[PDB]
Amino acid sequence: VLFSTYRSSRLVSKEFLHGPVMRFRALGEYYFQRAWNGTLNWALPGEYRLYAVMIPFIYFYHRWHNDHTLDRDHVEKAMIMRWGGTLEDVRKLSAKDQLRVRCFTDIEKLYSAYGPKDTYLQPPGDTLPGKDFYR
Amino acid sequence: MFLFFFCDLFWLRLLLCMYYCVWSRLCFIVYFNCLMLIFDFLLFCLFDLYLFVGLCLFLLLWFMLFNLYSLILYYCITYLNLYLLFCIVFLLYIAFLFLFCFLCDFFLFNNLLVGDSFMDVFFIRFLLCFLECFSLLCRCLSTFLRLFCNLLSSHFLLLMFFDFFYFIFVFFFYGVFCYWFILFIFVFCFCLLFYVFLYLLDLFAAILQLFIFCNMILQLIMDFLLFLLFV
Amino acid sequence: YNMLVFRDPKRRPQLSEEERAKVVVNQAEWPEEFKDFDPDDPYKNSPEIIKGMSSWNLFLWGVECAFIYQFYELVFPKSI
Amino acid sequence: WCPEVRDRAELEVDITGWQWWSPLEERRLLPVRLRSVNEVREIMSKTQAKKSA
Amino acid sequence: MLLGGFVPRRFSQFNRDPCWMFFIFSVGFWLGEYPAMMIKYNARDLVYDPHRYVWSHHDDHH
Amino acid sequence: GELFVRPKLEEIPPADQCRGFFGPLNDSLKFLRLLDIKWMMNRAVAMRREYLIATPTLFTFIWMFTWKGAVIYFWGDRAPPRRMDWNTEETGRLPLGFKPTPAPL
Amino acid sequence: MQGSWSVLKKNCSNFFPGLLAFAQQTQEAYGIWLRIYNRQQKYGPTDFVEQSETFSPDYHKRFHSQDKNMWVDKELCTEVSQKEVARLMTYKLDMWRMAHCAGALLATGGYAIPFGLFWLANDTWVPSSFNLTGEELRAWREAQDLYRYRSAPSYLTDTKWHFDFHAYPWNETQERAWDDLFEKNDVRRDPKVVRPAAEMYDGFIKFELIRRKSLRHLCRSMNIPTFPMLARLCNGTRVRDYWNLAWCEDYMVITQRLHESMTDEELYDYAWRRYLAPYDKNLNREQLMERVEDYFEFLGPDFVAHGKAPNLVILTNYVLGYYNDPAYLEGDISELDKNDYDHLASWGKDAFLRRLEFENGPLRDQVEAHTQRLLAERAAIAK
Amino acid sequence: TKYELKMQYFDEWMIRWRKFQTESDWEIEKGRQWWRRFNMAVSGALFCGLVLYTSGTATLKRQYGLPHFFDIGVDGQAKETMLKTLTSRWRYTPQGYGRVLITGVPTYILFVTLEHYRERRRMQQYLQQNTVFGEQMRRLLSTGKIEEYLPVNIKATLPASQQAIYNY
Amino acid sequence: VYTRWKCDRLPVFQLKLFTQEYPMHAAVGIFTIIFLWKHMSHCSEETERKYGWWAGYPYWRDPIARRNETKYKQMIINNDVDITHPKWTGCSVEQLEELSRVV
Amino acid sequence: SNPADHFRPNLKALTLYAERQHYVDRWLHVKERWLAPWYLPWWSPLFQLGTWYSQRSRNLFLVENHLSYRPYKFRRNDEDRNNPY
């Protein structure tokens, strides 16, 4: 009696936002409602242009998220640990120095397991600072 | 501890809303055998043998939205955890098993005692019944383990190969301008071939693994179905 | 033909050879977009979406976007 | 504007009748067609002979 | 299901459809980001961090 | 697999024909039928009541795979240690001079 | 039917008088049922009294057997009249709904009060005794008929789809009976043509093998509460008892020709309890008599001869076919002159659409000929 | 009276402070467990009896008739005796919801009543205890709140090797 | 005609689906949810340090310590707890004052 | 290691902590508040459903007499195998 269990109990008029809804449905139907757009379990459509458009967009936004939110944490950790162990110590550097450090981190990422090991293993006799430099 | 997070399907949910506000026919299904259990006419079953269709279709859609799109770089399989897959398979398998057990028909289990009366009951048939009862749960575990391991291994291999390709492409492309350009060209062609092969293999394997995942459940259901003949 | 895994659909013939031979071709009635129609290149005369925008121009636009993405921090670095 | 089909389809699906093929009913109804005039003559003749006897 | 749709015959036809225009733009981005990395990460003036031996992920995960 | 039809009363062999671990438990040994598990299994197979063998097994597995497995894993009592920390039975008692509150009345 | 404030006020006003009337009807119906049960236990067949077990051939689950667990008392008129039987049936329905409500109340204590408010706002599940005037009774009957309309088509479709998908009729007469059984109420079904479907479905599914979902749909269509449904042998027992009483009353009427002497309102009620005559159809005595005679004919001579009714599943489908109204169609035909995809006109046709129009348009033959000739020339040049 | 609402807090506190559980409280809880098992057994016996009484005549004949699994002779005698006893008199043999109610409602009522009165008995037992648990129970029933860290406030007894904390 | 999926609103259809179509599955899912929240809903501080942080635990600020400090300050302030009580310190107030004067 | 780190959820937003004691006590208070009113008799199935299973589990915990030691569920460090405390 308070709320109807039937979808027929309308809450708005039939003409509410008709135009924008028609534009949205036109956007949806033009490429999808076609004979050659036969989906595989609703997930893989038959239209080539759908792939061609959606794959790049998905990759783009995922990459933006990864670069500006996820890998940034590793980069900041490397900068902090290698240059004082504190955020203020890193901020004591200039922007150019931070750029150099971050690009070296990118180098390390690109090398991964297929590259020289002197980037993280100190050869004997090297004059550069060791692990106990800030301790 | 309460962690608040989100799945990686929001754009796909948006696309589903956009492209399925109007009806469309479906004619290609990853696991079609859930719709055709009976192949000989005049055979019928009093049990709700078509109850699995909706769950099958939804599971296929969900796992396809995750796994197939995971081939795109940086796409996350949010559900990729061993025990979470265990929970999913537990739900489905144990629900169907308890549906069969709540029927309170003990004769349904007569086939568990393998063999004929000729075989010794205690030393052969009983041991076989023990093994088969164990094998049901083992089938559940194998289903979930297979689904987990396939994705894990495929994506590990893809990540490693992509790392190697990035390394050689970035730090050895200058060889194109050098006298050893032929070696680099050969390596680059091999890497492209490997890239294409891996992508095709992963695409096929995802769908096939989903097919097998649904087929294990359907086999569980079919092992306890009995068909009457119309007269 | 194919572009990677995307294959161009081909219409199956519906007329028999006898009936087909009796058909008179009059390209004057055909649209200007499809004249000297070639199954192996049906879009050769198709109009460009944007006049003067070549495919190479878009490819170069993407390359420039990538170069910007990789080099902007080299010219306008920002502190942590 | 074809309500019978709509209602039958919706009811079949709502009662777990997902399948969209009915080979048996089609086999029962596939050969149905309006008869020719000669067939009508013959069938009326059989009906008339039946009524007479 | 890969049933049909517009298929450019060659590169020059990618401009005959907006979707393929976006696709070729994306391909250009993809392929041109590699030369950029070559130039940036093989530069003469690129210098390894002096404190690279102070800390590494290898010690952390170990 | 196929439909199961219960045997008729006339199709059920006599109890004396059943065999135990060593041999039939005929007259003067009938009361041993209760204790011989193999004889009971053979009798059930002869009477087509095979479920009595299969139903307890499967259910047991389920009961272990579902409820007792985790109960044992999370709340089970592990093996006792060599040096055992027994209870001195000194804790809990109220101290001398304490005035406990009155009980409800 | 949806709940409303007017019905809520009606049921709140008549709550206590309704309860008192229900108690009086309970006493009367207990007396009637005591008579009937004593007669059944004394003169009933051995199988019926002993409750013989009938198990399914697949999972060996017991259920009521129409032949053995249902018995028509041909000599019940001596002890119990037709009106008493109808009163018992109506009270059985009302008592079922009241019992479910009371069970909810006992289970949930005082937290069922808002659910009681939802209950009194609708006449679907209130007893008939809550109506103290003709208009209230008419509204209550309308609500019951609405529920029957809501529920029956699902049951009919379940039966028809399962049979047609898993089996086919043996002979032409069975085919005609099966096809004509599920026709809409706007056409008149000949019981003689339809009867063989009973034997065919007995060959397919007897009442003893009825599935739980189909049983739920049937109980919905019979205004029998379904929550908690529980095992299928409870509402199945309810259905068996109701139809056994109905068959006893039907035998009494057929033997004594009571329906001819039955008045208009009583005849309408008698048809309604058989799910033959909706009140919203405003049927006259001629139509009611036609439907009742068709029902008796469908029961067949064997019902009088031996008290054996046709298959209960098919009987329920046949009677509920009167609540299977034709699919609604509203709107003038002129509406078919409009267009549905005008909003896409602004988008035009892309290159692929233009190609498809060119190839498959009125010039399709010319394009096909040109393409085939060009391909043949290229193939010849290649060779 | 609803004793469970009061006793849930006390049980949780005892679990949190189970170190101060004297052997008397442990015996009380063991007795509670034993009485729960006894109530389960008697309720199950009542349910089985009601089921047997309401069972159909043909069902009883099938269950307590031939064949005999063991065929010792005592089995057949007992089955025949029970069958004759049940089938001699008239028995109300309902089906469906009626049998459900008849078999369950008495069982549920018996089990619930026994458990509730045993909970009241346990509350009384803990009230009569002269331990810190009894004092906590009395304080809970008096003030209506559970006073945590009570054992260390009133300095409840500790082992001789752990009295240093009270040394103040 | 009436169909659950077309005529009923979404909550009603959800209840019907999981009560008269897939009730056992819902029951099993609820059982599993309860199990997970009863046995797999805890994480120790050491576990958080080892695996709980994307790039690793930042020991240089120890956010766990700050979190616990805020927690305990809030609890003490809201509940009016005397942290100088002998039970917390194991010694009398006078002994505490003597120790403060000593150190 | 690094490849293994790619298999993590990428949209973590917030983490909340709560002691078992606190929210268990709050749940018990809610249950008492909803089961206290007189119009819900103690013999109702709802009340028994609410109370009996919890009482049984707590009694089983109290009756437990194990010869081994069960480390505290909510220690600060549960990763060291050779330190149950």
Ligand SMILES: CCCCCCCCCCCCCCCCCC(=O)OC[C@H](COP(=O)([O-])OCC(O)COP(=O)([O-])OC[C@@H](COC(=O)CCCCCCCCCCCCCCCCC)OC(=O)CCCCCCCCCCCCCCCCC)OC(=O)CCCCCCCCCCCCCCCCC
């Ligand atoms: C203290 C800080 C705050 C936090 C407090 C938290 C308290 C927690 C208490 C303790 C809980 C313990 C247990 C926790 C377990 C968690 C498990 C978990 O997360 O699992 C992952 C799992 C992830 O699932 P998933 O696969 O990602 O899908 C779920 C998604 O929601 C998507 O699924 P879906 O799409 O299927 O969902 C259906 C969807 C269908 O699709 C849609 O409807 C589309 C929209 C989707 C919205 C939901 C997605 C949210 C996306 C991210 C946030 C969006 C932006 C927010 C901006 C915030 C800015 C600060 O519809 C909806 O979502 C319905 C809601 C729509 C709201 C629309 C509001 C319109 C307002 C307009 C106002 C206009 C005013 C005009 C005035 C003009 C004046 C002139 O999460 C869940 O399943 C849900 C967990 C929820 C558990 C309950 C938590 C308690 C409730 C908290 C509410 C807090 C409200 C106050 C916040 C105020 C701001 C700070």
Ligand SMILES: CCCCCCCCCCCCCCCCCC(=O)OC[C@H](COP(=O)([O-])OCC(O)COP(=O)([O-])OC[C@@H](COC(=O)CCCCCCCCCCCCCCCCC)OC(=O)CCCCCCCCCCCCCCCCC)OC(=O)CCCCCCCCCCCCCCCCC
């Ligand atoms: C205080 C403690 C409470 C405990 C907790 C309870 C929680 C709630 C559960 C439900 C309790 C019952 C609610 C009241 C029902 C009304 C009485 C009744 O049976 O109506 C007849 C009617 C029988 O239905 P049927 O399908 O026709 O029966 C087929 C038989 O063949 C029928 O046989 P027939 O064909 O030969 O015909 C016989 C018929 C012939 O009679 C007639 O035709 C005359 C009319 C007689 C019935 C009149 C019923 C009137 C109902 C309305 C009452 C007024 C409500 C007012 C509401 C507003 C108030 C302001 O007479 C009968 O109907 C007799 C049926 C058998 C008696 C059943 C009662 C047994 C329990 C009572 C004794 C307990 C003793 C305890 C001793 C303790 C020792 C330690 O009952 C029903 O409609 C069934 C109940 C429907 C709801 C079911 C809900 C689920 C139940 C699950 C229970 C599981 C066990 C318990 C534990 C639960 C844990 C989860």
Ligand SMILES: CCCCCCCCCCCCCCCCCC(=O)OC[C@H](COP(=O)([O-])OCC(O)COP(=O)([O-])OC[C@@H](COC(=O)CCCCCCCCCCCCCCCCC)OC(=O)CCCCCCCCCCCCCCCCC)OC(=O)CCCCCCCCCCCCCCCCC
């Ligand atoms: C004084 C009176 C006299 C004395 C008393 C007498 C006895 C009375 C009691 C007995 C009465 C029986 C008859 C009742 C009939 C009416 C039933 C009914 O409800 O009809 C639907 C009724 C309308 O009926 P109608 O319009 O007449 O249509 C009837 C048709 O025939 C349509 O019919 P239909 O058949 O299509 O509808 C059926 C539908 C009925 O359902 C519905 O229609 C759903 C109703 C709810 C829909 C809610 C939608 C709105 C949601 C809003 C969400 C919040 C929004 C935001 C709020 C912000 C606030 C600030 O579906 C079902 O039947 C499903 C049943 C599901 C059963 C669930 C069983 C679970 C068992 C668990 C598993 C156990 C397994 C075993 C485990 C064993 C372990 C040992 O629905 C409503 O009126 C909706 C009311 C919504 C109220 C507001 C939203 C909820 C407010 C909650 C407040 C909470 C406050 C406390 C919060 C504390 C927080 C800490």
Ligand SMILES: CCCCCCCCCCCCCCCCCC(=O)OC[C@H](COP(=O)([O-])OCC(O)COP(=O)([O-])OC[C@@H](COC(=O)CCCCCCCCCCCCCCCCC)OC(=O)CCCCCCCCCCCCCCCCC)OC(=O)CCCCCCCCCCCCCCCCC
């Ligand atoms: C998009 C998001 C939207 C929001 C989503 C919300 C989130 C949902 C997530 C999960 C949803 C799925 C959950 C599924 C769970 C598993 C279900 C399952 O296994 O079912 C098996 C199975 C399926 O049921 P079925 O009988 O086969 O048919 C179900 C169909 O729906 C029957 O359909 P039908 O068409 O055949 O019959 C239609 C009609 C037929 O008409 C009738 O039958 C006549 C009227 C009957 C009235 C009821 C009679 C009851 C008789 C006694 C029942 C036994 C009592 C046992 C003892 C009590 C235990 C508490 O029946 C009705 O209209 C039923 C009306 C019921 C209205 C209440 C529905 C729930 C609304 C929420 C209210 C409670 C909120 C609590 C939480 C909030 C607190 C602040 O369930 C049963 O066997 C039923 C047992 C019922 C036992 C009582 C309920 C136990 C649960 C605890 C109750 C707690 C009450 C708290 C009170 C307030 C305290 C403060």
Ligand SMILES: CCCCCCCCCCCCCCCCCC(=O)OC[C@H](COP(=O)([O-])OCC(O)COP(=O)([O-])OC[C@@H](COC(=O)CCCCCCCCCCCCCCCCC)OC(=O)CCCCCCCCCCCCCCCCC)OC(=O)CCCCCCCCCCCCCCCCC
């Ligand atoms: C129909 C369903 C079909 C579908 C099935 C679908 C599922 C698959 C099936 C498998 C199950 C999967 C698991 C799913 C999860 C379900 C939940 C779960 O597992 O929870 C377990 C969970 C395990 O407990 P826990 O939480 O781990 O805590 C462990 C503690 O032990 C807890 O401590 P507590 O304080 O709670 O006490 C528990 C107590 C439970 O037991 C008791 O409380 C006491 C006994 C209760 C008896 C109940 C009534 C039985 C019938 C009475 C008599 C009827 C006939 C009367 C007429 C007689 C005329 C002569 O057990 C014990 O502690 C063991 C005591 C044993 C004493 C033995 C003393 C020695 C002498 C007796 C034995 C040796 C005799 C030798 C004779 C030799 C002759 C030559 O709960 C329980 O098992 C205990 C609570 C529930 C008890 C229910 C009692 C009734 C059980 C049904 C009996 C009738 C049906 C079976 C026969 C059917 C024949 C056709």
Ligand SMILES: CCCCCCCCCCCCCCCCCC(=O)OC[C@H](COP(=O)([O-])OCC(O)COP(=O)([O-])OC[C@@H](COC(=O)CCCCCCCCCCCCCCCCC)OC(=O)CCCCCCCCCCCCCCCCC)OC(=O)CCCCCCCCCCCCCCCCC
């Ligand atoms: C908040 C409340 C919470 C409540 C919790 C309790 C559970 C829920 C309560 C009730 C809920 C309502 C709905 C219940 C189901 C309704 C089923 C139904 O529709 O039946 C219709 C049906 C009526 O139809 P009918 O045509 O008259 O007769 C049926 C036909 O024969 C049918 O013909 P058929 O062809 O189908 O014949 C086959 C039929 C034949 O059976 C029958 O139908 C006859 C009636 C049942 C007989 C059951 C007893 C069998 C003998 C037991 C012997 C035990 C000995 C143990 C000795 C131990 C010594 C140490 O079925 C069977 O063969 C099944 C046999 C049972 C197998 C049990 C297997 C259990 C495996 C256990 C696995 C392990 C568990 C964990 C570990 C435990 C140990 C550590 O009703 C019945 O026959 C009886 C219904 C009884 C309902 C249950 C009453 C509940 C009372 C509760 C009291 C305690 C409350 C505790 C509360 C605690 C605080 C909250």
Ligand SMILES: CCCCCCCCCCCCO[C@@H]1O[C@H](CO)[C@@H](O[C@H]2O[C@H](CO)[C@@H](O)[C@H](O)[C@H]2O)[C@H](O)[C@H]1O
């Ligand atoms: C409807 C039934 C109503 C019954 C009413 C009461 C009937 C008369 C009393 C019955 C007997 C009571 O006697 C009962 O004996 C058992 C031992 O066997 C005691 O039990 C004691 O020893 C057993 C030995 O295993 C321990 O497990 C248990 O922890 C301990 O409490 C009970 O504490 C006592 O209460």
